[PDB]
Amino acid sequence: QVRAKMQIDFLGMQANLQNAKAETLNKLIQCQAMLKSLKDNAMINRANALVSLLQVQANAANGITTSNFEAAFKIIAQIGSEYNQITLNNGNVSVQEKEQTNELKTILNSLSKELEKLNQQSEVNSIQIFSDKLEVLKDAPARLWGFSTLSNAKEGFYNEANEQIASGSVCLFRSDKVRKHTITFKAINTKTSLSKNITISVIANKLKER
Amino acid sequence: QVRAKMQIDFLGMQANLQNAKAETLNKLIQCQAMLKSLKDNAMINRANALVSLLQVQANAANGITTSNFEAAFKIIAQIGSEYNQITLNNGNVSVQEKEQTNELKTILNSLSKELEKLNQQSEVNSIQIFSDKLEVLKDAPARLWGFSTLSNAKEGFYNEANEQIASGSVCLFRSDKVRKHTITFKAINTKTSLSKNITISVIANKLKER
Amino acid sequence: LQVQANAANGITTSNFEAAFKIIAQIGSEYNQITLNNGNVSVQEKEQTNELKT
Secondary structure, eight states, X not given: OTTTSHHHHHHHHHHHHHHHHHHHHHHHHHHHHHHHHHHHHHHHHHHHHHHHHHHHHHTOOSSHHHHHTTTHHHHHTTTTTTSSOOOOSSSOOOOOOOOOOOHXXXXXXXXXXXXXXXXXXXXXXXXXXXXXXXXXXXXXXXXXXXXXXXXXXXXXXXXXXXXXXXXXXEEOXXXXXXXXXXXXXXXXXXXXXXXXXXXXXXXXXXXXXX | OTTTSHHHHHHHHHHHHHHHHHHXXXXXXXXXXXHHHHHHHHHHHHHHHHHHHHHHHHTOOSSHHHHHTTTHHHHHTTTTTTXXXXXXXXXXXXXXXOOOOOHHHHHHHHHHHHHHHHHHSOOOOOOEEXXXXXXXXXXXXXXXXXXXXXXXXXXXXXXXXTEEOOSSSEEOOOOOSSSEEEEEEEEEOSSOEEEEEEEEEEOOOTTTOO | OHHHHTOOSSHHHHHTTTHHXXXXXXXXXXXXXXXXXXXXXXXXXXXXXXXXX
């Protein structure tokens, strides 16, 4: 039951990794939208207040508005005082755009660079070999177990050049030798191919010797 | 099952660390937006009330409004009394911008500096070696186990200069010596490369001696 | 343009060079606008953003 569900479990774990990356990216984007929404809701309110000021200066017919246009415009100028504030010299404006400091924008940029640096090492399609009893005798099995996360494959075992010794995902490694063998789990596909190495060392029986 | 899922688990733990940093940054940004929204909602309401005051002074045709313009303007001046309040000397305004004290802005700045100081030590792509039985006899195995969080690598074991003694993520260290050996786990990649040291000390058998 | 339509004052012709730069600061981080002598020109500055990448 564990070995049957392993491919779908690794695909679900990769999907959960994608979910945990996309949630952090969405929180960063919501944070940057909340950062820019302050500037936007200040600027459109300043613009709407200026439109209403020209609306009361349009149908005025009083003359007090010409004297208060130097007074109320500095009240509309205090809407974006922490932003590109405005002034009136003798009836003309001049946008400052003071480039106001904010550390949190730089921390957001550093966290975005951290997320992009994390995004490169998020791999897909990696195989893995396993073997109990790395030490082995002359005729002991030492069952090799491979795992390929490919869609469809052949997942053979090859013996030190290309020599096929198993069929798929399990190998029974008899040695009849003394040397350290290196067995290659191979998962071929119509798209790509993967290989993995394991090293099984053989010893002789210390009791049978001399 | 534990060793197969370790790369995806470490990637998920790094993604959860990114989530726990981005949530704190988003809470700080929401807090600063709530700080600035008080100033913005005071200033646009003061501006809207002043626009309505010039609206009632426009279509007045009464004369009482010229006497109440020194009275109602001080009521509009109490909108931003804890902020850049306003006055009227003989029909002109003067913005104060008193630079009012607030400790919580400084505590927010200190927490942002704390978060940025925490952001530098958040590393990615670190390998780790492990070995049971740091003490070892002349021929005892003392199975070394390495872990590289790289995407694809070779993850070999090198013997004190460059001498390859294993293939990947497992090593069986026979010694036939007496000295303290230093084995280097190495994970090479097309982008970068990492190394890690372990020290396995060998002793002779105390029973076989003398 | 609604307040410039039913104006009948003349101050709006002088403030149309003033208020239009206030409307120009709405999209200052976006394709901002200007007025040379009564005509506009869209910039579309192609502003950088790492998060899109």
